[PDB]
Amino acid sequence: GKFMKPGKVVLVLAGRYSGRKAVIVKNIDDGTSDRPYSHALVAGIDRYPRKVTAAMGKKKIAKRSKIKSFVKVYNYNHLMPTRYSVDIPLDKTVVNKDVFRDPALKRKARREAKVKFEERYKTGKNKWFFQKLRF
């Protein structure tokens, strides 16, 4: 049946954020009034962490392993789904469709997404999600 769930990893296909990897946080397969097309709110990473390695100090390690995230609602036609998924928890109250009516709490949503992405990336799990797509 339907495969594009609220835990999927999606390759964003258009817009300023093109070629980035995001995670769907809330899908809507039936268009709402303001958006007749089916869509989904996702959280992605804009600046991937740099290729860290040994033989460098952990101050440099921390400086390089820093993520810049974005939160956006996308049309389904501009999203390419994958077979991967990440179980990273995102707070629904902070990250929701109401975040776009002001620029104050959108910064909070991006902050929370960035913090969660960093603490998950530091563990080394889902490492594919944190490497840029070479295209």
Partner 1 sequence: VQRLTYRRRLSYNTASNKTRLSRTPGNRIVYLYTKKVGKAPKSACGVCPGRLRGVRAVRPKVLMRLSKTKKHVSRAYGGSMCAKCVRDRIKRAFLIEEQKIVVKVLKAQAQSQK
Partner RNA sequence: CGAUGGCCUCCGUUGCCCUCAGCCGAUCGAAAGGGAGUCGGGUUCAGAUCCCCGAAUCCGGAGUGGCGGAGAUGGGCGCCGCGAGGCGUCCAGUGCGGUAACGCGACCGAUCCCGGAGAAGCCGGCGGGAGCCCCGGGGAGAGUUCUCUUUUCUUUGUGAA
Partner RNA sequence: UGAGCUCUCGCUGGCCCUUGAAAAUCCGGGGGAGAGGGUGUAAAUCUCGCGCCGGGCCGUACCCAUAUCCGCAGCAGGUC
Partner RNA sequence: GGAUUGGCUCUAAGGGCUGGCAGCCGACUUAGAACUGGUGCGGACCAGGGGAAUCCG
Partner RNA sequence: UGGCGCCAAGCGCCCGGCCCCGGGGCCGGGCGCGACCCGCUCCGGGGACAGUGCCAGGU
Interface contacts to RNA, rule CB under 7 A: 14-18, 35, 37, 39, 50-51, 53-60, 62-63, 66, 68, 70, 72-75, 77-78, 100, 103, 106-108, 110-111, 114-115, 132, 134-135
* Interacting residue with partner 1 among 15, 60, 98, 111 (CB under 8 A): 15
Contact 66, 45 (CB under 8 A): no
Of the candidates 89, 95, 104, the one whose C-alpha atom is nearest the C-alpha of residue 72 is 95
Site residues for partner 1, 51-110, by CB under 8 A, read 80, 82-83
Of the candidates 72, 71, 77, 69, the one whose C-alpha atom is nearest the C-alpha of residue 129 is 69
93 touches, from partner 1, RNA, none (C-beta below 5 to 8 Å by class): none
Closest approach of partner 1 to the CB of residue 81, in Å: 10
Q: Is 131 in the site for partner 1 (CB under 8 A)?
A: no
Of the candidates 101, 104, 112, the one whose C-alpha atom is nearest the C-alpha of residue 73 is 101
C-alpha separations of 106 from 26, 116, 123 in Å: 16, 15, 26
Residue ranges that bind partner 1, judged by CB under 8 A: 11, 13-16, 18-19, 80, 82-83, 133-135
